[PDB]
Design a protein around this ligand. Structure first.
Ligand SMILES: Nc1nc2c(ncn2[C@@H]2O[C@H](COP(=O)(O)OP(=O)(O)NP(=O)(O)O)[C@@H](O)[C@H]2O)c(=O)[nH]1
Ligand SMILES: Nc1nc2c(ncn2[C@@H]2O[C@H](COP(=O)(O)OP(=O)(O)NP(=O)(O)O)[C@@H](O)[C@H]2O)c(=O)[nH]1
Ligand SMILES: [Ca+2]
Ligand SMILES: [Ca+2]
Ligand SMILES: [Ca+2]
Ligand SMILES: [Mg+2]
Ligand SMILES: [Mg+2]
Lengths: 166, 166
């Protein structure tokens, strides 16, 4: 059985935990409890193949930035998440990309750019802006809502499909 | 409004028309009526962006192979479909890939490999085999069922997302 080591990264409060919990546990976490580092595992079938998802839900809090090297070495694919109502979180993506590239010593690490909170109307990052950033990285862009479940499976399953082209 | 010119290709009877009709019209065509060439259009929102899908549903019948050059020139992205219960249809994929590459004079034309009829149990093409073929092409592989609707939106929307990385 193939195991896929996925790691969810991004700035504080963009919805990393809510996305992961929605995928794994099928409910929306309304409250905000800052994460240190949590793991989830689930057996799923993706394109006819039974596999095991091992998901690491990481800290957006800058205080825990020292933990990044460790999880970037071990992860196989990265969900790089920002919130569409948080311009700064979008600007923060590049620092994650750059660290992952440096650590895995590769320009094509499996990755998906995720614009989360697409149910909210106070958008300050346009889809086209995120599309451009993802294009430069050579990776897909997918919008999600952990709240409505829109795009949540798609984002994670796309990341699996990216690990497979690797 | 961005328009995406998608073209669905593959051997006869793999489910090109059923896939397209499921996407556009939300029902499953049980009967088999061989296609000459049909067009469909639909406005959809994909990752926060309203766009227009222009879909060309092409012939799998070898008798209509002369029509291929024309539609390959005009199409922007290609859904390359085989059926997971039809080994020959999988083997036929390469002739579509090669023609598209030759016609658009490019090694990276936006494309998604689709293994359809994944609801059927008489599988003769393993996911891993199709994954390998897609990896060599540098494109995603997605399994679908036009019958159950599984993966149908995903396949077409992934092809849009591929046109965007282009
Ligand atoms: N409306 C809406 N709220 C969301 C969405 N995703 C997360 N939230 C909310 O945003 C807040 C922060 O979410 P959370 O998942 O904890 O963010 P995080 O990225 O894990 N934070 P940290 O990095 O501190 O661990 C929570 O109140 C959560 O309910 C979403 O898609 N839509
Ligand atoms: N069980 C099952 N049957 C399917 C599926 N997709 C198509 N079929 C069936 O397969 C037959 C052929 O489907 P069709 O869409 O017409 O194939 P096509 O690729 O368009 N053929 P052509 O190239 O001649 O135009 C039909 O009987 C249809 O109901 C699927 O996902 N599951
Ligand atoms: Ca809740
Ligand atoms: Ca029917
Ligand atoms: Ca989906
Ligand atoms: Mg968290
Ligand atoms: Mg047809």
């Amino acid at each position: 059985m193939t195991e896929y080591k996925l790691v969810v990264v991004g700035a504080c409060g963009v919805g990393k935990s809510a996305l992961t919990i929605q995928l794994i546990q099928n409910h929306f976490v309304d409250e905000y409890d800052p994460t240190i580092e949590d793991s989830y595992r689930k057996q799923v079938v993706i394109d006819g193949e039974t596999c095991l998802l091992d998901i690491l839900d990481t800290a957006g809090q800058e205080e825990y930035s020292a933990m990044r090297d460790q999880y970037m070495r071990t992860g196989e694919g990265f969900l790089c998440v920002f919130a569409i109502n948080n311009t700064k979180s979008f600007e923060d993506i590049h620092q994650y990309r750059e660290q992952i590239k440096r650590v895995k010593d590769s320009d094509d690490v499996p990755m998906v750019l995720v614009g989360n909170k697409c149910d909210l109307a106070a958008r300050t990052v346009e889809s086209r802006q995120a599309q451009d950033l993802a294009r430069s990285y050579g990776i897909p862009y997918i919008e999600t809502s952990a709240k409505t479940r829109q795009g949540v499976e798609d984002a994670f399953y796309t990341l699996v499909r990216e690990i497979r082209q690797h």
